[PDB]
């Protein structure tokens, strides 16, 4: 229960004046895609569910 | 009579528009630390030495 499609996305900074170059990071989004979970509850409030 | 502690210090220039990169220099200070020398003289002038 760990398989997850991922969506790579990176950031690179760039500027002159610094000693050496800055390594890039990887801001990636993940999706669980296997694990289960409940989502249905019996509680309610006025607008929670309408007929 | 040459041993000398040295104090490294460098300069790097950086700019875009030039053909190739500029190599850095090493502006370092040195201290003699071994050789001898006289420093005491008998001459004087008004404020040179006070009692």
PDB file of C-alpha atoms in Angstrom:
ATOM      1  CA  UNK A   1       0.000   0.000   0.000  1.00  0.00           C
ATOM      2  CA  UNK A   2       2.620   2.514  -1.115  1.00  0.00           C
ATOM      3  CA  UNK A   3       2.461   2.602  -4.911  1.00  0.00           C
ATOM      4  CA  UNK A   4       2.006   6.247  -5.875  1.00  0.00           C
ATOM      5  CA  UNK A   5       2.070   8.030  -9.199  1.00  0.00           C
ATOM      6  CA  UNK A   6       4.255  11.111  -8.833  1.00  0.00           C
ATOM      7  CA  UNK A   7       4.432  14.394 -10.720  1.00  0.00           C
ATOM      8  CA  UNK A   8       7.928  15.854 -10.932  1.00  0.00           C
ATOM      9  CA  UNK A   9       8.424  19.607 -10.729  1.00  0.00           C
ATOM     10  CA  UNK A  10      11.707  21.357  -9.995  1.00  0.00           C
ATOM     11  CA  UNK A  11      13.053  24.773  -9.050  1.00  0.00           C
ATOM     12  CA  UNK A  12      16.348  26.273 -10.167  1.00  0.00           C
ATOM     13  CA  UNK A  13      17.733  29.492  -8.745  1.00  0.00           C
ATOM     14  CA  UNK A  14      20.325  31.459 -10.646  1.00  0.00           C
ATOM     15  CA  UNK A  15      22.316  34.563  -9.781  1.00  0.00           C
ATOM     16  CA  UNK A  16      25.859  36.021 -10.138  1.00  0.00           C
ATOM     17  CA  UNK A  17      27.888  37.121  -7.029  1.00  0.00           C
ATOM     18  CA  UNK A  18      27.833  33.749  -5.154  1.00  0.00           C
ATOM     19  CA  UNK A  19      30.928  31.437  -4.863  1.00  0.00           C
ATOM     20  CA  UNK A  20      29.541  28.195  -6.483  1.00  0.00           C
ATOM     21  CA  UNK A  21      26.241  27.201  -8.263  1.00  0.00           C
ATOM     22  CA  UNK A  22      23.086  26.267  -6.208  1.00  0.00           C
ATOM     23  CA  UNK A  23      21.807  22.634  -6.667  1.00  0.00           C
ATOM     24  CA  UNK A  24      18.153  22.278  -7.793  1.00  0.00           C
ATOM     25  CA  UNK A  25      15.327  20.853  -5.704  1.00  0.00           C
ATOM     26  CA  UNK A  26      12.489  18.530  -6.695  1.00  0.00           C
ATOM     27  CA  UNK A  27       9.036  19.704  -5.620  1.00  0.00           C
ATOM     28  CA  UNK A  28       6.956  16.686  -6.638  1.00  0.00           C
ATOM     29  CA  UNK A  29       3.334  15.817  -5.889  1.00  0.00           C
ATOM     30  CA  UNK A  30       2.281  12.263  -5.042  1.00  0.00           C
ATOM     31  CA  UNK A  31      -1.005  10.347  -5.135  1.00  0.00           C
ATOM     32  CA  UNK A  32      -1.686   7.444  -2.799  1.00  0.00           C
ATOM     33  CA  UNK A  33      -3.473   5.319  -5.377  1.00  0.00           C
ATOM     34  CA  UNK A  34      -3.513   2.091  -3.341  1.00  0.00           C
ATOM     35  CA  UNK A  35      -4.500   2.530   0.299  1.00  0.00           C
ATOM     36  CA  UNK A  36      -8.140   2.407   1.406  1.00  0.00           C
ATOM     37  CA  UNK A  37     -10.067   4.629   3.802  1.00  0.00           C
ATOM     38  CA  UNK A  38     -13.626   5.366   4.889  1.00  0.00           C
ATOM     39  CA  UNK A  39     -15.399   8.522   3.772  1.00  0.00           C
ATOM     40  CA  UNK A  40     -19.064   8.106   4.781  1.00  0.00           C
ATOM     41  CA  UNK A  41     -20.372   9.259   8.156  1.00  0.00           C
ATOM     42  CA  UNK A  42     -23.923   9.440   9.527  1.00  0.00           C
ATOM     43  CA  UNK A  43     -23.630  12.820  11.265  1.00  0.00           C
ATOM     44  CA  UNK A  44     -25.200  15.891   9.692  1.00  0.00           C
ATOM     45  CA  UNK A  45     -25.699  19.640   9.968  1.00  0.00           C
ATOM     46  CA  UNK A  46     -28.233  21.875   8.160  1.00  0.00           C
ATOM     47  CA  UNK A  47     -26.614  22.077   4.741  1.00  0.00           C
ATOM     48  CA  UNK A  48     -24.581  18.882   4.958  1.00  0.00           C
ATOM     49  CA  UNK A  49     -27.076  16.852   2.918  1.00  0.00           C
ATOM     50  CA  UNK A  50     -30.231  17.929   1.119  1.00  0.00           C
ATOM     51  CA  UNK A  51     -33.198  16.017  -0.263  1.00  0.00           C
TER      52      UNK A  51
ATOM     53  CA  UNK B   1      65.408  33.233   8.219  1.00  0.00           C
ATOM     54  CA  UNK B   2      62.411  32.948   5.904  1.00  0.00           C
ATOM     55  CA  UNK B   3      59.731  31.091   7.856  1.00  0.00           C
ATOM     56  CA  UNK B   4      56.615  33.256   7.716  1.00  0.00           C
ATOM     57  CA  UNK B   5      53.050  32.662   8.796  1.00  0.00           C
ATOM     58  CA  UNK B   6      50.771  33.764   5.968  1.00  0.00           C
ATOM     59  CA  UNK B   7      47.147  34.869   5.849  1.00  0.00           C
ATOM     60  CA  UNK B   8      45.351  33.896   2.651  1.00  0.00           C
ATOM     61  CA  UNK B   9      42.801  36.249   1.125  1.00  0.00           C
ATOM     62  CA  UNK B  10      41.502  36.078  -2.434  1.00  0.00           C
ATOM     63  CA  UNK B  11      39.548  38.149  -4.936  1.00  0.00           C
ATOM     64  CA  UNK B  12      37.129  36.832  -7.537  1.00  0.00           C
ATOM     65  CA  UNK B  13      35.637  39.002 -10.250  1.00  0.00           C
ATOM     66  CA  UNK B  14      32.477  37.952 -12.013  1.00  0.00           C
ATOM     67  CA  UNK B  15      30.565  39.434 -14.928  1.00  0.00           C
ATOM     68  CA  UNK B  16      28.661  38.357 -18.093  1.00  0.00           C
ATOM     69  CA  UNK B  17      29.697  39.663 -21.587  1.00  0.00           C
ATOM     70  CA  UNK B  18      33.352  38.428 -21.541  1.00  0.00           C
ATOM     71  CA  UNK B  19      34.595  35.409 -23.628  1.00  0.00           C
ATOM     72  CA  UNK B  20      35.965  33.120 -20.810  1.00  0.00           C
ATOM     73  CA  UNK B  21      36.013  33.254 -16.934  1.00  0.00           C
ATOM     74  CA  UNK B  22      38.668  35.371 -15.059  1.00  0.00           C
ATOM     75  CA  UNK B  23      41.099  33.374 -12.789  1.00  0.00           C
ATOM     76  CA  UNK B  24      41.226  34.465  -9.109  1.00  0.00           C
ATOM     77  CA  UNK B  25      44.184  36.098  -7.390  1.00  0.00           C
ATOM     78  CA  UNK B  26      45.620  35.517  -3.922  1.00  0.00           C
ATOM     79  CA  UNK B  27      46.185  38.683  -1.892  1.00  0.00           C
ATOM     80  CA  UNK B  28      47.946  37.224   1.148  1.00  0.00           C
ATOM     81  CA  UNK B  29      49.730  38.943   4.029  1.00  0.00           C
ATOM     82  CA  UNK B  30      52.975  37.569   5.455  1.00  0.00           C
ATOM     83  CA  UNK B  31      54.838  37.967   8.749  1.00  0.00           C
ATOM     84  CA  UNK B  32      58.602  37.617   8.966  1.00  0.00           C
ATOM     85  CA  UNK B  33      58.603  35.779  12.278  1.00  0.00           C
ATOM     86  CA  UNK B  34      62.268  34.717  12.196  1.00  0.00           C
ATOM     87  CA  UNK B  35      64.682  37.447  11.129  1.00  0.00           C
ATOM     88  CA  UNK B  36      66.201  39.861  13.649  1.00  0.00           C
ATOM     89  CA  UNK B  37      66.683  43.621  13.484  1.00  0.00           C
ATOM     90  CA  UNK B  38      67.578  46.556  15.714  1.00  0.00           C
ATOM     91  CA  UNK B  39      64.933  49.008  16.875  1.00  0.00           C
ATOM     92  CA  UNK B  40      66.593  51.188  19.543  1.00  0.00           C
ATOM     93  CA  UNK B  41      68.385  54.424  18.678  1.00  0.00           C
ATOM     94  CA  UNK B  42      69.862  57.134  20.914  1.00  0.00           C
ATOM     95  CA  UNK B  43      68.678  60.153  18.911  1.00  0.00           C
ATOM     96  CA  UNK B  44      65.737  62.201  20.149  1.00  0.00           C
ATOM     97  CA  UNK B  45      63.422  65.112  19.414  1.00  0.00           C
ATOM     98  CA  UNK B  46      61.073  66.985  21.793  1.00  0.00           C
ATOM     99  CA  UNK B  47      58.254  64.468  22.055  1.00  0.00           C
ATOM    100  CA  UNK B  48      60.250  61.379  21.125  1.00  0.00           C
ATOM    101  CA  UNK B  49      60.688  60.260  24.739  1.00  0.00           C
ATOM    102  CA  UNK B  50      59.262  61.690  27.943  1.00  0.00           C
ATOM    103  CA  UNK B  51      60.164  61.245  31.598  1.00  0.00           C
TER     104      UNK B  51
END
